[model samples]
Target: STGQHPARYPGAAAGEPTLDSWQEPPHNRWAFAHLGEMVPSAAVSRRPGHALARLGAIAAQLPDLEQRLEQTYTDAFLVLRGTEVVAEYYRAGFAPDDRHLLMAVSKSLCGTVVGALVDEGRIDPAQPVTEYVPELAGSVYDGPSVLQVLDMQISIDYNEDYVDPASEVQTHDRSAGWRTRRHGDPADTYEFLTTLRGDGSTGEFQYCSANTDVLAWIVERVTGLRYVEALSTYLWAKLDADRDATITVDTTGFGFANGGVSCTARDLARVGRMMLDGGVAPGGRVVSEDWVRRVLAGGSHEAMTDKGFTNTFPDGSYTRQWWCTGNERGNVSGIGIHGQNLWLDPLTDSVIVKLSSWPDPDTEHWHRLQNGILLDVSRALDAV
Candidate 1:
């Protein structure tokens, strides 16, 4: 229901435009073209060294990660062995150049943006959340430090199960008009935050989407600019991205840092490479090395494992909005709803970006397949 933002045109005759004209499939309709100009991704840059070769031999006897490239809902897939683009495929409906929505992968992007600010001395990880966004001063999230949010350990009472209509995640979708529901529930994101009171201890792990929204608020307030502008000034432009990416922001112009990024598959790989290089871009330092090192080391391993994501890895860890797969491969990944991933395996200096439009919302099976693909690719690169 279009509760408030009715689909109507002003200063026009009856035949000008109406709700019927605005009606479009949610999945088919694309948001603004300059979303990154609005919500922004982290800083990206190319290394000065010659781009690495695609040195890996395709794994034998492994499941054809390629055969299932379009499984169920997936629309595109790209496998990179180091900096080289080794294997790539796109379904008939999608293209290699399409800027697929990053979804919650946007949260990991927000985490990296925050890390850049910390590296530049613009933010202090140990500071209280209230210190930046005074609006949340006494709310459930007030007690946690910036570090807690980075580690996904913020103690907030928000459910993220997408299947539950009464859950907070669904509520957010209703408010954003991204789903069909009553838009009158909570007018905007800020109002939604106020509804949640204290739930658990601040240091415990919770997979609530609220934590990332809180980070978005803090980043906006501290910078005086919307998160998008801050992101462009701090990160995106530096990467020399091939095509400009977009991010969705709230009605008030606050960049939807929790998850609203959109970019092409190759450009997303560029971002992973930038992080693997410790935030250094083509020309100079885009973000700090110390911060990158801290994030890669794993921020809140125990707290995250305590949550339902124990199967994330043999040794699962959460750090700076990024997920760590603690194994000999030194692989870490940023995952989002519907199969969006940026996998960075530091030990092999390989970064793989898989951007897809998976119509299937249930992602457990898809995730299992993704992990398997990552492992297969990692072995190939290591063997090279």
Candidate 2:
């Protein structure tokens, strides 16, 4: 009843759902939109600002799009052609104001805020990570630079699988207070991080969720503010967002910057719109032009290709935690495990955000369609 709605899937096979089962199939249909009730979180607030003006609803224009959304488990979908909204759709029991978990899309937001810090000389990516997070000294992050961590190139003994039971990712969920911890699990996210061991490897592309948490710690050390507060000050307020966003926090009160953000679909597209404009927002510059250019042009394509990601993103690269789509349009995208996305195509001047509740965490079948649909939307809206 957090959003004043009754539970859609009220029970698991046994009975009422537990934390361990909340993120999976049947239950995720309910938990994805009702995350505020499952765990503790902090708000990223925004001030009153100019709202995104609405245009003609294009939902009816797309053939079979409504049925496709249901099949895809889409909770909320929005499309923006430049600054004007071209389409908006929501499933039943979800609303314009309801927040849906961004999952890994949160990493892109954290990296975007880091760009602002880079502009102000508050954080230097080339510096040793301990320069900001001294507590990470004895851990795997002791020697790698912030940029390495941001790119997820630092080697660490952690798994990224979302379905593996008792895997490192599961431990991460346990420590983050999303699930009950086992006998030897770390107490919280901070402890889980400082306990990671190096894999004796470095400077290779990999997708480890732990890296972004370290960056959030750095943001805290540099700005002397909580992650939520720093995010609000650096990004959200500048988005001129219509509603407050929330981020899941661990027992130590650290925001789960890697994959814990939740906000409205329209508000999320504003992020894409801002990036499409080279980090310039209607309110002011959120991040520097150099940062956006670096995000779009920088990062190691060879590294990404070698790290087993070429299958999905053949010509793509990853920079500053944002996935470079490597398409002809020079587009960039933010991807989340359970079908959340923030897509920006600069050439077509389009932004699309889809907050979905897929039964599985990261599926290639869903991803293929997700990117295809986004590209289709962008191409169809161009010059229309």
Candidate 3:
């Protein structure tokens, strides 16, 4: 019951629970949707002309879906087939207009922006990272190509363990203004990136949030626009989103391109449906068909397995910041740390978007269960 009305709890505004505690349960019910209030943010504006595509409602198919979502602490869930909205639900205190944090799913959004740039001939994946962000020269990113960073192939000395207080991710959080910084710490995200050292050569896929930040920096450099501005001009406006989205920024105004996007579940479904339709938006091709083709082509599963994710995704591969299931049905997913997911299955022309705030950042049990549920939902939609 406390989780149902976090804002009404004592000291809710004074930081008793605190911003760092935002991802935790009781506080999350409010914090997840109120991120812009807790931190500095940049807006991605929605265009005014196009109306939202109507999503046709289908009869309830996944009866246990609500039970599973509650068990996993889901805040919102929406399922879509083609342009039709098959199912949608919101937990207590969460409305359709509320914006939930996308976490690492933001990386996939950054990837889509990169695809749009590629389509416009403004960015070349083969180009060296240093060419765009020269400040990264002499760092681990100096010799890497944009494609390598997008694919997480660079071997950088960074630890993403959230539980460890001394982890580099903690420092990153501080630098990004997600946490309180100690005296004399790096002033901003750019300074933190320059400090990263290479532990090995670039060849294997290693999941790193910092890589997406670097990609965002590159996007900013080449486009001569802020990350939010670029996002609005290239994709958000094209989606005919019902509401504006927000991206958290560091003290220095650097967008947290790795996982700072906050948006409505329905809007995110629009993004998934756009990808499902080969990047075609209401106006026309927003993201190129060629770019979508490359994303679906995916990387080598053996390569991904070499990186020790075989158990997490037995037949999966990571490419262009998106995860591919490598199944015959061609399912791809954008997963975040704490239960956020955008699952797209081309075989069934279905997409599932879930926004959640689980106690744990990563739980294998919940992940497997969610995957099975999504597949079942897709198959059921196909049957309908």
Candidate 4:
């Protein structure tokens, strides 16, 4: 079914085992390898004639950069100028071709998928969440329009405290059998989502993982298909991507729309190129140019301002799951946990993707240093 083999999961095929049947340790590695087949990402292409010499220079700096880069446990680093892959570093059990986890960066990628839906008139930013998914009709998300979801402004009582054992995220993990690999737990992502309650107003800027989960649920309902299938059809295949991308799905087979995505370092660069080209793929327009412009413009009036994440850049904002670095100033980013970054600087015509598995998931010192290095790299490439 859906190109997925039925015999892969012993009890899961018959729906008798539930999510627990596949929660065993042996299934964990299989789950990771087959994740792409489960939740597919849209393909992207490399625009021909993109120069790679600049990337070469950047790669040369890796040996020296390694000491500082290793300070944070970087798995892979890639630099692309327009469409060319200029520099790369593969450490921490990663290769140029190996797909690694994108973590929350998947939220940014899913942001573009929402843009595609908007272009097709399947979604309305001003409409209430209940308009698309009736299940959320009585939930806290009922009041806010779809725009609030993209802007990360759903005032829900959520804690994104990843390291804390008592956090809701941890709870979800336990419920889904992610914590202990137990069988017979809640495998349906929607079941886990329905249990969440929103306590704040719609427009208030709140940083929480549940916001993305709700968005994914809505996307799934509106499209009448799994989120990954929608992504593959609308984005990946249309882009003529050189390689496939993957997203992690929950028990009910819901792709982690907010995060849980992974791809090769170079493939991630291709996504940045697609955005730089205004959502147009190599062959034709994948999504409307208008939608791309609006996303780049930032989602809503209030989201254009900072969402309370203090950083080296104060004017930065969060827009449509994509983090706005400085609005019209120049640089912007789609950042995630563990040093994962997809930095875009329009002024320099450059896009950089860094995939790291850091020892520490969150740190201000790491953020500052990484930002500094990115700026330095941008300046170097911009000069050329």
lDDT of 3 by residue, 1-384 (tens): 001111223345422345466678676776677576555567575833212222233335655666776787778888887887777778877767789999999999999988888888889999999878888887899899999999999998999888889999999999888889988778778788888988658878889999998888888877866687777777888898999888887754467889999899999998898998889887567788878887888887656844334674578799998988877677888988888989988877888998889888886777777777677767777754
- Candidate lDDT scores, in order, read 0.67, 0.79, 0.79, 0.68
Q: Model 1 off-target regions past 4 Å?
A: 1-63, 180-183, 306-308
For model 3, what is the alpha-carbon lDDT of residue 69?
67
With candidate 2 superimposed using the best TM-score fit, by how many Å does residue 42's alpha carbon deviate from the native?
14
- Residue 23 displacement (Å), model 1: 21
Candidates' TM-scores? 0.81, 0.83, 0.84, 0.82
Cα error, residue 344 of model 1, in Å, equals: 0.6
Off by over 4 Å in 2: 1-61, 306-308
Q: What is the TM-score ranking, best to worst?
A: 3, 2, 4, 1
> Which lDDT tens digits does candidate 4 get at residues 39-68?
334636453211112236754544356565
Local accuracy of candidate 1 as per-residue lDDT tens digits, 157-176: 67777789788788876654
**Residue 16 accuracy (lDDT) in model 4:** 26
